[PDB]
């Protein structure tokens, strides 16, 4: 798990960029899927273009050898692409390159062999048909869940990257549908909206953190992942966002202890769509999107730059994540008043893959019914 600290810092860097940009919208993105796509792309770049990318993903190239970076990403992909995975995770990366380019076989081999990703040639001379081909690829890859991903292409496009991820997890310890009811969600300290709110009395991995001024809830999914939800104390959302660190998350993931609580958690259907040229440009990744780009690992003779790069992430949170019957279990609830922990005001969340501890997703809910 050598690259996990870097992925965590990338997650927080990207989150803080998006949060300072717009503080009134739900945020949801996958640090892992973005970082993996750009680590893969780096194999086609050289010199400053290459270094900017890996440094933009929070790798200090004076300290970590490149071989360990790629081995880390490949080991992570090994755990997510497992066959019998109960994690209902659908992800893909597509590279779309102008059909007139002479491509380097080494790069295409690395994309398919090392990063288990897809590369296609398209006629960008027909921008409308190219956009349709790109969007059909995403729609097929998500069985219809993400449609019309790319809304526009520049006329001079020669290279586009699309990165998509859809997740609908199944709780190990699920909620009962019969207990979901409409409850107030406090969008601010004087205003509420009604949202569907799941609830359950149970033994939870839950604690209050003085450091974060927040309640911290960990719930495991079937498969290899855990959701962490952070509910800030009154007026402490900004403090929570400022104080999150990888070491703090690691301590929470080592807790295991369980206490009784009456938990209220909203159903969620949220998406995030991001222009990675703009977002990653603010993190220092600019040359690969510019005319100066050194993409000679992709095509040796012709100029090339990455004209379009889009990330779309889709999340569903519900009671069970499946119509299938769940394994029966019993939690022993003590005869004492459980705290009532209601995720009924803006909150932050992170999903972690259990083996590598990597940040599969990060987000913020400001209003469940926004969307």
Residues ≥6 apart with Cβ < 8 Å to 113: none
CA distances from 114 to 64, 65, 108, 138, 341 (A): 19, 17, 10, 21, 44
CA distances from 310 to 34, 135, 197, 301 (A): 9, 11, 32, 26
First and final C-alpha spacing in the chain: 35
Label residues 278-296 b or e (16+ Cβ within 10 Å = b): ebbeebebbbbbeeebbbb
C-alpha 90/C-alpha 9 separation (Å) is 24
C-alpha 308/C-alpha 313 separation (Å) is 17
* 53 three-class SS: helix
Secondary structure percentages of the chain, helix, strand, coil, to 5: 30, 30, 40
Burial class (CB in 10 A: 0-12, 13-18, 19+), 93: buried
| Per-residue DSSP letter, 288 | G
**Helices (H) and strands (E) in the chain — how many of each?**
9, 14
C-alpha 316/C-alpha 322 separation (Å) is 11
Give the H/E segment covering residue 201: strand 191-209
Tell me if 161 sits within 8 A of 95, measured CB to CB.
yes
Tell me if 203 sits within 8 A of 331, measured CB to CB.
yes
* 198 three-class SS: strand
Maximum Cα interatomic distance, the chain, rounded to a whole number of Å: 74
- Beta strand pairing call for 268-275 and 308-317: antiparallel
Sign of the CA dihedral 217, 256, 353, 141? Answer: negative
Residues ≥6 apart with Cβ < 8 Å to 160: 95, 96, 130, 134, 150, 153, 306, 307, 308, 309, 310
* Cβ neighbours of 362 (radius 10 Å): 26
| Per-residue DSSP letter, 223 | T
C-alpha 263/C-alpha 268 separation (Å) is 15
Q: What is the resolution of this structure in A?
A: 1.5
């Amino acid at each position: 798990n050598k690259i996990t600290p870097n992925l965590a810092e990338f997650a927080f860097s990207l989150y803080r960029q998006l949060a300072h940009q717009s503080n009134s919208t739900n945020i949801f993105f996958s640090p892992v899927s973005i970082a993996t796509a750009f680590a893969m792309l780096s194999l086609g770049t050289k010199a400053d273009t290459h270094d900017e990318i890996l440094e933009g993903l929070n790798f200090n190239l004076t300290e970590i050898p490149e071989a360990q970076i790629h081995e880390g990403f490949q080991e992570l992909l090994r755990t997510l692409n497992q066959p019998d995975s109960q994690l209902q995770l659908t992800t893909g990366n597509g590279l779309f390159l102008s059909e007139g380019l002479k491509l380097v076989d080494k790069f295409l081999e690395d994309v398919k062999k090392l990063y288990h990703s897809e590369a296609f040639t398209v006629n960008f001379g027909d921008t409308e048909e190219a956009k349709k081909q790109i969007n059909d690829y995403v729609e097929k890859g998500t069985q219809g869940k993400i449609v019309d991903l790319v809304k526009e292409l520049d006329r001079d496009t020669v290279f586009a990257l699309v990165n998509y991820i859809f997740f609908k997890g199944k709780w190990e310890r699920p909620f009962e549908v019969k207990d979901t009811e409409e409850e107030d969600f406090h969008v601010d300290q004087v205003t509420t909206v009604k949202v569907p709110m799941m609830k359950r009395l149970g033994m939870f991995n839950i604690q209050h953190s003085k450091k974060l001024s927040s309640w911290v809830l960990l719930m495991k999914y079937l498969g290899n992942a855990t959701a962490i939800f952070f509910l800030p104390d009154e007026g402490k959302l900004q403090h929570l966002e400022n104080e999150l660190t990888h070491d703090i998350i690691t301590k929470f993931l080592e807790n295991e202890d369980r206490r009784s609580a009456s938990l209220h958690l909203p159903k969620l259907s949220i998406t995030g769509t991001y222009d990675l040229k703009s977002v990653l440009g603010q993190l220092g990744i600019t040359k690969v999107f510019s005319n100066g780009a050194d993409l000679s690992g992709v095509t040796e003779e012709a100029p090339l730059k990455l004209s379009k790069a889009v990330h779309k992430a889709v999340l569903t949170i519900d009671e069970k994540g499946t119509e299938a019957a769940g394994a029966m279990f019993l939690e022993a609830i003590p005869m004492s008043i459980p705290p009532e922990v209601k995720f009924n005001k803006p909150f932050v969340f992170l999903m972690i893959e259990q083996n590598t501890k990597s940040p599969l997703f990060m987000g913020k809910v400001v209003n469940p019914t926004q969307k």
